[PDB]
Design a protein around this ligand. Structure first.
Ligand code: MG
Ligand code: MG
Lengths: 457, 453, 160
């Protein structure tokens, strides 16, 4: 059956839908399967499956139902574009506090529509949230501002947070793990657990947390500077997440405000993110997106983009989220992903299809991770336009010839170099640790700074 | 960094890895990106990223780390096949109870490896869980057995549970919603909330729950048979899920054991599933997989298959999960998906790559939903081989010419027809409601039963 | 939570959103639930914000649950008539931490889609820092209205 009469209204104007403030708008790149309806027919069916409908007419359908139908308001078949308007009354709300839930947004806008037999593929590229729905989201409670304050930096434009991941990803016992933390902290600010690190049998959670707490205390006493750690508290069980978080804060004691909580938000889901967000609003919530590539990759024609994911994470209340290296590291990414960073940090920003006003909702920090080092940094910062962010370089720090501490300093210096607009090769002459990064990663040094060896050694 | 020397050992035998009981095994269909390492090099890097490694050598790496490395033990480049052995010590365990978590399995085996710059794509098709790891998973607490007991059916081979979804998907107010439930329940057993139904402003949760409870009481008094409802308790907030669940059970009272709890497990995640599983172990946990098609579709070359999803759901403790219509309904699916059902229901079963022993872990029910009706059912049951399952037909029930109750009866009769081995067209002469399904869905009747007129 | 969050609910700009027109329903105590709610509705036809008077709560003549429900109905009616959002600041003060939680939780569930229109008033000087923190930590997303009743015993310039 053809449902385009009911679920398509191409005469609706996007500007009026936005001005009305009663509709969530979603922009998809969609292709119908061969042998079914045309583009508008398939889009109308997509809208029906994503709101009030099904594949057949039902006797229960009355007047009221029609008013909450999702509507295809714009199509561009040549570019495979479909835009759908979802009345805000469709989205589920908490009984306990009347607030919105991202689970409902996902269920309607990217749920059953992903398994439709007449659709080859459909991927969400952007969404618009009006004030009436936006204000019902948690939003971030803790921001980079709170990390800057702990570090003794200015709370506005406090700058670059030098970070790392203790490698190996898994395998280090509690004390060796803690010793590596101490070493890095002599030169750097921030350490994160690698995504799967927790309570493995060879590195029990409580032993590791205690050793790291001792290492932080020692590093702070030596350097006279505050240090930060992001612990993985991810679990299937809500109560396990609470047990981990509570143990950490009590253990760190006077250093409890130096602690972020990492959550594997993509694989554990929105429920895990919210547990951390609502139980620990005063602790920086570090959304780790491990597994997101299954849908967000440009190779994928389904689900949603990294842009959409990041925008949702801000609404969920992530204090920071991994935005990728934007083509400058080892993982998949593009230079145009800078727009992701601005969507999560600014009060107003443009997506690929919709302009978004955040109405003073707190920003989410871009966390930069994956195959970065001191040499690759100036190019990254040039593309982005700022260094108010966290960057974690595991290999870039501990792979430095002179070790972790020196590795941390080369990262520090690389951003200092970028900030003062200096030539990296010339800058390196007067900055040892940064100059030693060229020798640590020669392949990168030859590609990025072709004639470095002649000038430097 | 060529990391094949450390993270690849093709001389390891799969049979010995299984016999040892110390490794989770994963089977992936993978393709390297052009311009990087070869197949084995890329697989080794994949294994490193999925366990102990990174893209560069690090000074901190000691010899203990080497013992917990994931290892590529088998490759078949021509068929894009890569098999990896993950030592069970890698997987995270609860501090509170020492039990396993699926979140850790997912993070290692299908996490950061999905964003690697040197991999075009990689999708998991099967996994093997040894006894030492398997026994640490929750597993299902409630099964179809418990639903059969409530219905007054035999607890062994209690048969087909006739179900539906109250359509429209959203839009019905509490009393009209409840009236439709009552109507269906005159002929059927089971009703589920549609995946997004909850506490919308036009149909508040508490008003709807109360109206449905009244409708169940009325339908049970009229028919003299027990009726079942599966309520959506999904939420981002753990405490919201608890509030919904607790309210429902207190409201239904003496009918509280007639209630299943539906969780949008794919979009809300494992954390939401576990909340329901651990807080309400005595209530049938209905895993709704909405959104799964983003990765599970054969069109997708990434993430994991529907088979893998279903197998994980059993470990998580789903009492039932949607397995799709196996090519017989409106959604994407294939006849070979019958193997999904057997993996979730049997104590021993074969996946596409690994044989799995469940060690007496409870079964997860196959829930059949999406564009089904009485006409499409006999073909579905023939392919599967049994009718010990729940089937929900929204359009197939309320789209019936005579209405919901008659729609329910046509579904009942369609399974009776299959069970007896009768010809659907001839069976329909003696069974009105089933015969009226041909008239209700003529397009389907013409394809499946050409000369029905 | 700040005034920014109240401005957002009112549909005002989040920067310099301006003046929030408020009142206290007088008499301070004595109004039964429905007369109390009727007075709220009346004021809300022209104003934004209503606060409980400091001692208003669960008096025997105006039970807490009956009053909260009547006010919720009055807010809904006033918003439907005016087409503008309305705000209420409820007194949740108690000696018992769990009483404060019971009151707060009841209010938010009752107001439902209007739960972000609710502030929580605490008699912070007389009940003390412990009461303030209960509200602050249990309900961080609800505007915390510190009522200072009794402060004059020390803060007055007459006091040395
Ligand atoms: Mg990592
Ligand atoms: Mg459905």
């Amino acid at each position: 059956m053809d449902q385009s009469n009911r679920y398509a209204n191409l005469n609706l104007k996007e500007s009026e839908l936005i001005a009305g403030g009663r509709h969530v708008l979603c922009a998809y790149i969609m292709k119908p399967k061969a042998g079914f309806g045309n583009f508008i027919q398939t889009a109308a069916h997509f809208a029906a499956e994503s709101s009030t409908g099904t594949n057949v007419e039902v006797s229960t359908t009355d007047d009221f139902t029609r008013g909450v139908d999702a509507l295809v308001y714009e199509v561009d078949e040549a570019n495979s574009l479909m835009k759908i308007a979802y009345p805000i009354e469709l989205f589920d709300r908490n009984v306990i506090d009347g607030r919105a839930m991202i689970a409902s947004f996902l269920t309607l806008t990217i749920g059953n529509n992903q398994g439709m037999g007449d659709v080859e593929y459909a991927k969400m590229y952007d969404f618009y949230v009006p004030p009436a729905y936006l204000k019902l989201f948690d939003g971030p409670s803790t921001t980079i501002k709170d990390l800057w304050r702990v570090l003794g930096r200015p709370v506005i434009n406090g700058g670059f947070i030098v970070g790392t991941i203790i490698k190996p990803k898994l395998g280090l016992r509690p004390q060796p793990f803690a010793n590596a933390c101490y070493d890095f902290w002599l030169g750097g600010d921030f350490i994160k657990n690698d995504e799967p690190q927790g309570n493995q049998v060879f590195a029990p959670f409580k032993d590791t947390v205690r050793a790291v707490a001792d290492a932080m205390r020692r590093a702070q006493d030596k350097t006279g500077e505050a240090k930060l750690f992001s612990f993985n508290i991810t679990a299937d069980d809500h109560y396990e997440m609470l047990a981990r978080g509570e143990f950490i804060l009590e253990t760190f004691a006077d250093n409890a405000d130096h602690i972020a909580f990492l959550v594997d938000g993509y694989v554990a889901g929105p429920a895990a993110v919210t547990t951390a967000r609502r139980a620990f609003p005063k602790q920086y919530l570090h959304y780790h997106r491990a597994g997101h590539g299954a849908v967000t990759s440009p190779q994928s024609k389904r689900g949603y983009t990294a842009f959409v994911l990041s925008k949702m994470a801000r609404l969920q209340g992530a204090s920071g989220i991994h935005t990728g290296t934007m083509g400058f590291g080892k993982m998949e990414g593009e230079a145009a992903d800078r727009a992701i960073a601005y969507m999560i940090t600014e009060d107003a920003a443009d997506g690929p299809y919709f302009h978004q006003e955040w109405l003073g909702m707190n920003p989410t920090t871009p966390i930069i991770s994956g195959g970065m080092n001191a040499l690759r940094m100036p190019g990254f910062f040039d593309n982005l336009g700022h260094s108010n962010l966290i960057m974690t370089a595991g290999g870039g720090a501990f792979g430095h010839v002179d070790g972790g501490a020196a590795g941390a300093k080369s990262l520090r210096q690389a951003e200092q170099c970028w900030k003062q607009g200096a030539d990296p090769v010339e800058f390196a002459k007067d900055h040892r640790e940064f100059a030693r990064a060229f020798e640590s990663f020669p392949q990168d040094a030859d590609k990025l700074y072709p004639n470095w060896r002649a000038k430097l050694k």
